Amino acid sequence: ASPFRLASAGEISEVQGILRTAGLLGPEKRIAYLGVLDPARGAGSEAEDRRFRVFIHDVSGARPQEVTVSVTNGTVISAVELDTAATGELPVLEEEFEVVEQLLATDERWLKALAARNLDVSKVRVAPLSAGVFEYAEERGRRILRGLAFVQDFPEDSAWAHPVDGLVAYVDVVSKEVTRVIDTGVFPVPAEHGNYTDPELTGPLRTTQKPISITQPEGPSFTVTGGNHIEWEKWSLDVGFDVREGVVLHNIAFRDGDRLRPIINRASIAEMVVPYGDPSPIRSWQNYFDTGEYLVGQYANSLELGCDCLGDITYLSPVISDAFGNPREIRNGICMHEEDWGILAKHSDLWSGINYTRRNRRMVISFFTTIGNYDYGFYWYLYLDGTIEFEAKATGVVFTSAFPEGGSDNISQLAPGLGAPFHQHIFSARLDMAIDGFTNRVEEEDVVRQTMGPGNERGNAFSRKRTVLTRESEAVREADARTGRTWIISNPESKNRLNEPVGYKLHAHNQPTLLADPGSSIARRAAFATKDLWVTRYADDERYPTGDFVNQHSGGAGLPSYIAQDRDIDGQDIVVWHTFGLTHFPRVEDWPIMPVDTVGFKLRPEGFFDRSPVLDVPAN
């Protein structure tokens, strides 16, 4: 009965039926996005009204539509025609990816370029990539993908080992036209294979690894009710899934004695951008908005027991829509389990003679997505002591190019003639905060160094300072690792037993933010990525830091437009947006398949509790 339950196959089928009945889903229509809307602000509100948001593409070239449907009542609530040259194109459809290689295989400019390189078109794979917004006026209002070529020597070959540099093509996937083919010159195609299951490359497999067996003889310590409501070691939350954002956590709360205390109303990764730093015209347009352009939940993997998730695993299998409105199950797409996490607290006291040790554990909620060559794991952790942490795991195969004779300032060499362009992987976490309720504020905390002198005669004192962010115009903040800068989200109307406002402290990793020139297309489209922390006043329609329609959309939407409203955020319903990412200069060890690298953030209680919340953990 919970309003936060996962979408069911029947709900998606019913949305299909409602759209069909309304005349909105004829044979020329495709569903590019479908997802459940969260309840509006208001305790109780409608007893039950499940509403869905749909983006509807038209393959004949007519204008697309944004539609909201009530599956409970069987009604279309609103339907608006979109002017995509103004507000952005819809997300890329899975069926449009296949179009690109097929169209290029019959284009005489493409065939001439491959013939000049002595390449067989039947062996050339084309990576179909999002287009962005650059200097090509004919692309405005059209759905464009750009293609880069790789050779596959045989059907099981890793094409990523054999980039065809100097060549790029642009394709209109609705009119099925190749608009431009650009050939800047022949580069040798790197010849070494990158087949990481070939015994010639792996050598004999290790025989030295003995098994590690992780079991839970009495089952796990968490309970799952209503399909997706979790209770674990005083935590309470609902696990959602959205085709765009992937796993979404709702209603994160902590049972403190007899009271369920809210902490975070909604937590998600609301965008992720992968900008490339190679100025070659073959790749200087290359920027993936995996969330906003491709929809990461759509490409979620089925996770295999014992390989992907080890231990006593509970799975969720979320349902999404295909392009025609039929439900599709992602079997075993979300893994949930608890993990031992070392020592929690320990002290051996000389004076009392008491020796005390307790162990920690964490609850893990994770999913993995694959987008072309890259594979990303998204991990949410809850700890016994009240800490909440997010970790992204990046692996897969690095995107390759030729390595130029004479070297490069923007490309790493991985193998003879094989390069890997520099790039970043930058995430935006949207944290709809609810620390003890919705009246919240953000303070920036810096360490304060003090000068030796009166009142500090030995020059040892140091302190800290907290600055309240009171309006959106002052709530765009940068990291400062040297001064230990953190941000505290507090509730000024809820005090702990020492009469201090309860709070949580956000600890960032302080990695570099977006490196592109501030005047670049990517800096305008991914403005969120240029600053570490943004705070906005909550609003129903302010969902993504890049806006609703990211594909081929110029600047003008998203966080810079939201904060211009300069709303009061001092003791209000607020949303924290945290930018964090990895800057990747590829190394030889990343080839031919990359070991996991990680980045994340965490939030720790800061006077939220009246004392340690884990004094009641037993010894076992």
Asked if residue 208 belongs to a known ligand binding site, the reply is no
Q: What is the CA radius of gyration of the chain?
A: 26
Catalytic residue chosen out of the listed positions 290, 432, 573, 590: 290
Which residue lies nearer to Na ion by CB, 380 or 538? 538
Q: Near Cu ion by CB under 5 A, which window of 14-22, 376-384, 583-591, 611-619?
A: 583-591
The reply on whether position 359 binds a second copy by CB under 8 A is yes
Asked if residue 296 belongs to a known ligand binding site, the reply is yes
Asked if residue 493 belongs to a known ligand binding site, the reply is no
- Which 402-441 residues touch Cu ion, going by CB under 5 A? none
Contacted by 432, from a second copy, Na ion, Cu ion, none: CB < 5 to 8 Å by type: Na ion
Catalytic residue chosen out of the listed positions 33, 170, 374, 379: 374
Q: Near Cu ion by CB under 5 A, which window of 96-104, 351-359, 449-457, 580-588?
A: 580-588
Q: How far is CA 378 from CA 226, 302, 369, 414, 564, in A?
A: 23, 14, 8, 27, 31
What is the pairing mode between strands 259-275 and 462-469? Answer: unpaired
Q: For residue 319, is it left (φ>0), alpha (ψ between -120 and 50) or beta?
A: beta
- What does the per-residue mask of binding to a second copy show for 391-420, with x meaning CB under 8 A? --x-xxx-----------xx--x-xx----
Judge whether 96 and 143 are in contact, CB under 8 Å.
Answer: yes
The reply on whether position 80 binds a second copy by CB under 8 A is no
Q: Which two tokens stand for residue 546?
A: 């890049």
Asked if residue 340 belongs to a known ligand binding site, the reply is no
DSSP-assigned states of every residue in 148-175: EEEE-SSTTS-GGGSB-TTEEEEEETTT
Asked if residue 584 belongs to a known ligand binding site, the reply is yes
The reply on whether position 589 binds a second copy by CB under 8 A is yes
Write out the residues near Na ion by the rule CB under 5 A: 432-433, 538, 573
Asked if residue 170 belongs to a known ligand binding site, the reply is no
Task: Find, among 429, 428, 342, the residue nearest to 388 by Cα.
Answer: 429
First vs last Cα of the chain: how many Å apart? 37
Which residue lies nearer to Cu ion by CB, 57 or 584? 584
Q: Near Cu ion by CB under 5 A, which window of 42-50, 326-334, 549-557, 579-587?
A: 579-587
Contacted by 611, from Na ion, Cu ion, a second copy, none: CB < 5 to 8 Å by type: a second copy
Task: Find, among 488, 507, 335, 516, the residue nearest to 426 by Cα.
Answer: 516
The reply on whether position 283 binds Cu ion by CB under 5 A is no
170: exposed, middle or buried (Cβ count in 10 Å: 0-12, 13-18, 19+):
buried
- Which 151-180 residues touch a second copy, going by CB under 8 A? 152, 155-159
Which residue lies nearer to a second copy by CB, 134 or 324? 134
Number of residues that bind Cu ion (CB under 5 A): 1
Give least dist CB 436 to Cu ion, A: 26
Whether 290 is a known active-site residue: answer yes
Q: Determine which residue in the list 62, 86, 305, 452 makes contact with a second copy, applying CB under 8 A.
A: 452
The reply on whether position 455 binds a second copy by CB under 8 A is yes
Asked if residue 373 belongs to a known ligand binding site, the reply is yes
Judge whether 193 and 153 are in contact, CB under 8 Å.
Answer: yes
The reply on whether position 567 binds Cu ion by CB under 5 A is no
Q: Near a second copy by CB under 8 A, which window of 71-79, 533-541, 566-574, 601-609?
A: 601-609
575 vs 536: CA distance, rounded Å: 5
Judge whether 5 and 226 are in contact, CB under 8 Å.
Answer: yes
- Which 97-156 residues touch a second copy, going by CB under 8 A? 125, 134, 152, 155-156
Which residue lies nearer to Cu ion by CB, 327 or 419? 419
* Long-range CB contact pairs, 211-216, < 8 A, 24+: 214/310, 214/311, 214/312, 215/311, 215/312, 216/311, 216/312
The reply on whether position 78 binds a second copy by CB under 8 A is no
| Burial profile 137-169: b = 16 or more Cβ within 10 angstroms, e = fewer | eebeebbbbbbbbbbbeeeebbbbbbbbbbbbb
Across the strands, what pairs with 170? 146, 180
Residue type, 599: V
Q: Which residues bind Cu ion (CB under 5 A)?
A: 584
* Residues of the binding site for Cu cation: 423, 425, 584
Q: What positions carry a catalytic annotation?
A: 290, 374
* Residues of the binding site: 288-299, 371-376, 423, 425, 584
